Design an enzyme around this catalytic site. Structure first.
Site, mmCIF file in Angstrom:
data_model
loop_
_atom_site.group_PDB
_atom_site.id
_atom_site.type_symbol
_atom_site.label_atom_id
_atom_site.label_comp_id
_atom_site.label_asym_id
_atom_site.label_seq_id
_atom_site.Cartn_x
_atom_site.Cartn_y
_atom_site.Cartn_z
ATOM 1 N N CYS A 40 0.770 -1.097 0.007
ATOM 2 C CA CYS A 40 0.009 -0.137 -0.274
ATOM 3 C C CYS A 40 0.964 1.320 0.002
ATOM 4 C CB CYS A 40 -0.828 0.077 1.350
ATOM 5 S SG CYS A 40 -2.248 1.206 1.187
ATOM 6 N N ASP A 42 0.130 3.945 1.904
ATOM 7 C CA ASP A 42 0.032 4.227 3.268
ATOM 8 C C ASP A 42 1.529 4.568 3.686
ATOM 9 O OD1 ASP A 42 -1.969 3.484 5.748
ATOM 10 O OD2 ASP A 42 0.057 4.381 6.165
ATOM 11 N N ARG A 44 2.551 4.833 6.477
ATOM 12 C CA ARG A 44 3.201 4.067 7.484
ATOM 13 C C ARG A 44 3.604 2.627 7.282
ATOM 14 N NH1 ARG A 44 -2.676 5.179 10.311
ATOM 15 N NH2 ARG A 44 -3.245 4.309 8.143
ATOM 16 N N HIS A 96 -1.900 -4.579 4.859
ATOM 17 C CA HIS A 96 -1.695 -4.009 6.087
ATOM 18 C C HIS A 96 -3.072 -3.878 6.725
ATOM 19 C CE1 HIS A 96 -2.464 0.256 5.504
ATOM 20 N NE2 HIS A 96 -2.026 0.104 4.386
ATOM 21 N N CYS A 99 -5.925 -0.729 6.915
ATOM 22 C CA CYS A 99 -5.975 -0.075 5.425
ATOM 23 C C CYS A 99 -6.844 0.639 5.244
ATOM 24 C CB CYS A 99 -5.715 -1.027 4.479
ATOM 25 S SG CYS A 99 -5.410 -0.465 2.737
HETATM 26 ZN ZN LIG Z 1 -3.458 0.902 2.986
#
Ligand SMILES: [Zn+2]
Length: 209
Positions: A40, A42, A44, A96, A99
């Site tokens: 992803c 993302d 993080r 993850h 998400c």
């Molecule tokens: Zn995600």
């Protein structure tokens, strides 16, 4: 300002050229990663940091909710470059927990363009509505769908002619499904690794050229 980023960059590069002034020079000659990360976007979930890889080690694709579609030349071209040109040995499909792409697919607000992107996860939550409806909280439905999504994306990568033709011609290549916990920093194996044609349903198997 972007000052700190430029400043961080100068410091990072100078520091590396201390323990090894040849580091970048050597690597620039050839890219030879053994792994492709599909994960992803993302912030993080930074790939290299999570598995302690150095520059050179990890070919990376990241998109919203780590979705792999058989008509998406963006992700497919990364897979094909990795498999055919670089001959990576492993594709790490890492989703993850928590998400936001997955979560948005579970609910009903329109987010625009991304609504179409996430469709396949929405199909997933419907295929498994009985299962997800027998979990309590949303957090659990979301996190479970995160896992289901990873397993689906593993199957999707494995079904590509890109991957199957690698196998047909005797390249070693495994497609793994892992899941990262943004709560605990832990990269977990979902144990769904596919490494050859024999593991594909007959209906997805393609004949060699
Ligand atoms: Zn995600």
């Amino acid at each position: 300002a972007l000052q700190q980023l430029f400043e961080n960059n100068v410091r990072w590069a100078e520091a590396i050229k201390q323990e090894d002034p040849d580091f970048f020079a050597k690597l620039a000659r050839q890219q030879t990663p053994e792994y492709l990360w599909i994960g992803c976007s993302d912030a993080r979930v930074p790939a290299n940091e999570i598995v302690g890889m150095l520059p050179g080690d990890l070919f990376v694709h990241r998109n919203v909710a780590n979705v792999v579609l058989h008509t998406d030349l963006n992700c497919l071209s990364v897979i094909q470059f990795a498999v055919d040109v670089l001959k990576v040995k492993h594709i790490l499909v890492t989703g993850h927990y928590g998400c936001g792409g997955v979560r948005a697919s579970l609910h009903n607000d329109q987010l625009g363009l991304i609504d179409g992107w996430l469709r396949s996860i929405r199909d997933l939550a419907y295929e498994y509505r009985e299962h997800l409806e027998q979990l309590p909280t949303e957090e659990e439905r979301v996190d479970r769908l995160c896992e289901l999504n990873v397993i689906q994306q593993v199957a999707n990568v494995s079904h590509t002619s890109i991957v199957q033709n690698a196998w047909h011609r005797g390249q070693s290549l495994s497609v793994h499904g892992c899941i990262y916990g943004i709560k605990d920093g832990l990269w977990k194996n979902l144990n769904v690794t596919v490494s050859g044609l024999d593991q594909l349903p007959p209906q997805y198997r393609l004949s060699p050229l």
